[PDB]
Amino acid sequence: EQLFQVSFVLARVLTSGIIMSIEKNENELKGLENILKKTSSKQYAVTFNSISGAVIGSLWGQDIVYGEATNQQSLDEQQEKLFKWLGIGHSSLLPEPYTLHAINWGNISNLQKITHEEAHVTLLDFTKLGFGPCAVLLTNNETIYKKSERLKIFGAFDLRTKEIKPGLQFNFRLSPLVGACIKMALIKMGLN
Amino acid sequence: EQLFQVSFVLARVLTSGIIMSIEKNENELKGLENILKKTSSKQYAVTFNSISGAVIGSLWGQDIVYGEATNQQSLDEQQEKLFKWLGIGHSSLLPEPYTLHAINWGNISNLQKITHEEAHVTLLDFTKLGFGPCAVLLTNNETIYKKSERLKIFGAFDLRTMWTQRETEKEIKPGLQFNFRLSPLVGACIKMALIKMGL
Amino acid sequence: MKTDFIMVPTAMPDEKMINYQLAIDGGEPVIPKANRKTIFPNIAKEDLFQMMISVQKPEEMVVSEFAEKYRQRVGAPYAIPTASGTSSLHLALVGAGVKAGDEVIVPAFTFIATAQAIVAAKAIPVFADIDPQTYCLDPRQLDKKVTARTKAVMPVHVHGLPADIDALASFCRQHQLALIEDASHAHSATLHGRYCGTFGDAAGQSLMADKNFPLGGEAGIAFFKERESYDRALAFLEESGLDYRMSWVAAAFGISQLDRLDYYDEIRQRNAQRLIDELATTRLFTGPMIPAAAKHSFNMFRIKINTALPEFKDIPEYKLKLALQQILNEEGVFAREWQNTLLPFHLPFQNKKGFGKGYPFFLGDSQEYKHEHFPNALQMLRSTLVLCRELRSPVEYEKLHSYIITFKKVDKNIQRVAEIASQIDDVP
Amino acid sequence: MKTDFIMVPTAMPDEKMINYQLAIDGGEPVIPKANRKTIFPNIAKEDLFQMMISVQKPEEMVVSEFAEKYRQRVGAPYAIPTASGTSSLHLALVGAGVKAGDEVIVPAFTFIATAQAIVAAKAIPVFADIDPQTYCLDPRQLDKKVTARTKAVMPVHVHGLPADIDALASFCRQHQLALIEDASHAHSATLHGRYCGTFGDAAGQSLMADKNFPLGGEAGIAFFKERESYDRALAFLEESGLDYRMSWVAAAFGISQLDRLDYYDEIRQRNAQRLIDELATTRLFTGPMIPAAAKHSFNMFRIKINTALPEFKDIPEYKLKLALQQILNEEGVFAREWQNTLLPFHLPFQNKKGFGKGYPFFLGDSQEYKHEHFPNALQMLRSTLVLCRELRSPVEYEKLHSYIITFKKVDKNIQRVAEIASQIDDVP
C-alpha cells in the first residue's frame, strides 16, 4: 500500500493547510530531523531541498570556502563539479569533508547501521526515494549546524527572530509535503 | 493496492461532484450495469442499495405479489422472512423465482462463469465486497426490468418523466414503492472492482 | 480532470438592472448563463481525506461512528442508521408501534416517500389538508379524520419549517395516538431550541446528498424517544428480513460534512432571512412565514405570489404561476414546482395496489378522496413558487443579491407579468 | 482530523461602524477576532485528487508536465522548472550571459533572494533607488549606476506591479545590457497584455506556496526568450553540478492550482480595484498607482499615507506609520511592513563574504553604500502600509467591505491618529 500511504500523508498535510516551510506550526521537518538524530547519534540536523545544499553546508561549516582545499578523492563527477564551482581545490594531505550515503528503498530499513560511523559530517541523500530532491546533514559540530542553517534564506536564524555572519545564501528550504513523505517512509520502514 | 484504488475512485467521483443517483450526467451506475450486462449477456440490469430490493423486483416483476406463492426451496433464512413479509407463500410444485449469487473477493474474478447461466432472473449480491449493501438484477425479461425500476422511488421512469415531462411507462402501474436507489459512490467502487478483476 | 469547479465568479449585479428589460423579452438577464450553476454538496478536501480514514476501518464501525456522532448533536436518545429516508420512516412507524391495518394521519402535501413508508408499515394513509402559511399538516382538521383504527399522526417538517408540534402532540395525547416526525428537510431546524426529530415518539430523516446535511449518496436515520420503540424497530428488522443498512461510504461523507454543518447553516440562515426581508418590500412576492418559536432550515424556500393584485383580474392563478416561472427562469433564477400533484392523486393511491391485491388498503374503508377535501394545499400549488438549490447552497453575497435584484426587477414589471400570463394557453 | 477550515462566516459589517470609537481606545473592532484568519493557498478537493494522479507517474514526467503547461500559459519560448525562485533567478542570469565579475543593476528594495541570485551568478549587485509611486527600479537612475563592468539590469515586478519594461529595455539596448526580470510577485501580471517573465532575455519566478500562483511548498521556474540562453542555462547545470530540480509533489499542486488560477485572479482583481477606488475618496490613504498599460497581480497591496495633512504638522512620518499600524491592527486589518531594511544594509552586503574571502565582490571596485543614495526607497518605508495575505487571498465580499469600513473609519479619526502618533516615543 505504497501509493495509498503516500497519498494519505499528502492528503493529511494538505488538509491541515500547513504546506509552507516557513509557516508557524510546521512540524513535519522537525519530525523528520528528530527521527534521523535518534537513528544516528548526532546532535544537529539540517534539512535541504538538494544534495547540493548539504554539500555546501558541510564545506562552509568547516570554513572550506573559495580558495581553500579538501580531499576530493571519494567525490563522484557531480560533486567534483560542485566543489570546483565553489572554488575549492584538492589535497590528499587533508581529510574528507563528509561521508555521503545515498538512501533508497533498497537500503532505507538499514539506516541505523549506515548512520553509525565515525564520520565528522554525515550527508544522507534521499533524492532516490522519489518524493523530490532532499538531503539531510547530520553532525555533532555546532558550528557546522549554525553555518548550514545560516546559508539558507529564511533558515532557522531568520525564523526565530551579528554572530554567525551570512555570506552567499540559497533557497534550500524543503517542501513540508516532501518532508512528510520521507518522515512517513522512515516510520513505515521501522526507524521509530 | 486495494486501499489506493478505492480511495482513487472515491476521490475521482467526489471531485466530479456528481454523487446523487438522480443527477443528470450521473454515469457510474450506467457503467456498472453495462459491464454486468456484457458479462451475463442479459439485456436488462437494475441496481439496488439492498439485496431486498432485487428480491422484491424479481418477485413483483413476475406478478408474485401479496397472496401469491412461489418455490422457496433455495431461500436462506433471511429471504424466507422477506417472502413472508411480502405475503408470499411456498409451493414445491411451482418454479423458483430467481437464482441468487453472493459475490465476494473470493469469486469476483469468476463472474463470467457465474452469471452466464440459463436462469431467467439472476440476482447478484455485492454486499460482501464491503462498499455497502448493493445488488443487481439481470434479466432478458423487459417486464421484470420495468416493474423493478417502477418500485424504486425516482426509478428510471420517474427520472425520464422528470426530465422529458412525459410519462415513460403508463402501462406499468406502481403500487408500494421503496428507496432502493444505489449511491453512485458505492456503484463506482463496485465498477472499479469488476474492471480490475478481469470482467 | 473532471470537476464541477465554477470558473467564473458572480459579479456584483448593477442596481440599475431593476430598470432593465425582462430577459424573456430579449433583455439582459440579472444572472448571466455562466453564473447559473450551483455547487451542492459542498465537497471539500476534508471529505476526500475522510474517505481515506474510513476506508481503513471496519464498515460497520464507520456507520456506527456516524450514527452516534449525529445522534448526540440532534439529542435523540436512540438512533438507527438506514439506507434511505424512506426506510427510516418505515422503521420509525413500526418502532413507535404501528401495525398492519392501522390508520396514519398524514398531510396530502409531501413527497411520495412519506405515504409510501406508511404503506410499507402496512398502514393506511389518511390524508389531511395543510395550513396555508406553514404548509404543514393542519391541526384544525384531525378531529374529522380520526377513526377507531387511527394509531398515529405523521407531520412533515416540509421545506425545513417545523410543523405545529405543540398542537399535534396535544391532539396525540387526547386520542392516545403516536407522533412520527418526517424531518427529511428539517436538518438543524428547531422548535423551542430543540431539533426536529426529538419531538415525536419516533422520527425518520432523509440524509440524501440533496439535503442541507448530506451524506455521500443515499442514506437515512430513524430516531426514537424510548428504548421500547428502538428495540421494536430492531426486532422488526430481524423478523422481516429487510436489509435497510447504511453504506460506510455514505456514512463517511456524513462524518466530515457534520464538522462543517454549523458554518453552512449560518450562511443559509442569513441569506434566507435577508431575502424574506427584501421580498417583504415587494408588491408581488412574500417569503415563507416562520413562527416565533421556530427556526427554518431553508432546505426549500417557498414564495407566495400575490395573485389578487388588480392587474391580474380575470387571470387564472396557475397562469400567473407559469408566467412568473418562465420570467424568473429567463433572469437566471430557477423557480419551480416541487410537487405538482397531492399524494391522494398519485397513481399508487389511485390504483391502491400496495403489496398486491390492494393490501393493506382493503383492511380499511373505501378511502375515496376528492380535490374538495384539500382547499389549502391546492391553493398553495396554484399560487406559489419554490427555490430549492438556490438557497440550499450557502451562496456568496453576489449571488444572494442577484436573487434580490431579480425579484425587484420582476416586481417592477407586474403589468407585463399580467400580459404574458394572459397569453398562456388553457390547460386542465 | 486536523483542518484549517474556518467555522465562523464573516458577517456583513455595519456601515455605521465608520462612526464607531477606535478599537485601540476600547471600541468595537470592524473585524471581530474570530474573523481575522485568511486561508492561503486555496486548497480544494482537486488538489488532493491531483496528488493521487501524479503519484502514479514518473516524477520527471510530472515536473515537465507542469513546466510545459505553465510555460504555454505564460507564453515564454523556453522554461526550466527549479527547486526555488532564487535558483530560477540564478539560472536566468547565467543563461542570459551574466559572467563572473560582471555588475548587475538591481533595486535596493526587494527580497534578499534577488541579490543572492546575482552573487550566486558570481556577479556584483549594483543597488539602485526605486520610483516613489511604482516602487520598482527607477529607470531615471540607471545612467548614474552603469559602468564598463555592467552586463545586465534586473528589475523586480515588486508587489505584483510590472516594472517600466519600456524604459528599462530601451536603456538595455542603448548600453548593450541583458534584461533579467524577477517576476516572483507578478504571476498573471501583464504589460500591454503580455505576461511578466516574457519581456527580458530571461526571467526567474518564485512558485512558493505564498505566491498568487502557488506550488506545493518550494518551487520556481526560469523563462528564456532565445534558445541560446536556455542552452547556456542547461550547460551551466551540467558544468556546475548544482541540483536545482523541482519536486513532483510541488509540481503536482501547481498543475491543479493552474486550472483555477483565472478564477482566483479575477476575485483578487475586482477586490483590489474596489479598494483602490474607495481609498481614493479618503483624505488619508491612497492605493497603489497602476499605469494604463499594466495589470497588477496584487500579491501585496501598498498604501500611501498622506503624511502632509495639516493635522500632522511637526509629526515624523514614521510615527504616523507606526500609529496607523497599531490602530488598523486593533480594528483587525494586519498592516505590516514587508521589507524593513534595504538590501545594501543587510549583513551579506555589509560583510560581502559571498563564496568566501569576498568573492566575487573583489572582482570589481567596491562601493560604500549610504542611506542618502536611496531617498525614494527610504521615503516609501516610513510613509506606507502593506496588506499581504488580506488581498492575496480571494476574500469574500463581506471581508472586502470590512477592509473598506476599517479604512473609512480611521479616515474619520485623523485628529485622533495625529494625537496617538504624537505620543509614540522617539526611535533613533
Ligand SMILES: Cc1ncc(COP(=O)(O)O)c(CN[C@@H](CCC(=O)O)C(=O)O)c1O
Ligand atoms: C418529504 C420527504 N420525506 C422523506 C424523504 C426521504 O426520501 P429518501 O429519498 O428515501 O431519503 C424525502 C426526500 N425526497 C426528495 C426531497 C428533495 C429536497 O427537498 O431536496 C429527494 O430526496 O429528492 C422527502 O422529500
Ligand SMILES: Cc1ncc(COP(=O)(O)O)c(CN[C@@H](CCC(=O)O)C(=O)O)c1O
Ligand atoms: C522579490 C522576490 N524575489 C525572489 C524571491 C525568492 O523566491 P524563493 O521561492 O523564496 O526562492 C522572493 C521570495 N521572498 C518571499 C516573498 C513572499 C511574498 O511576498 O509573498 C518569500 O518567498 O517568502 C521574492 O519576494
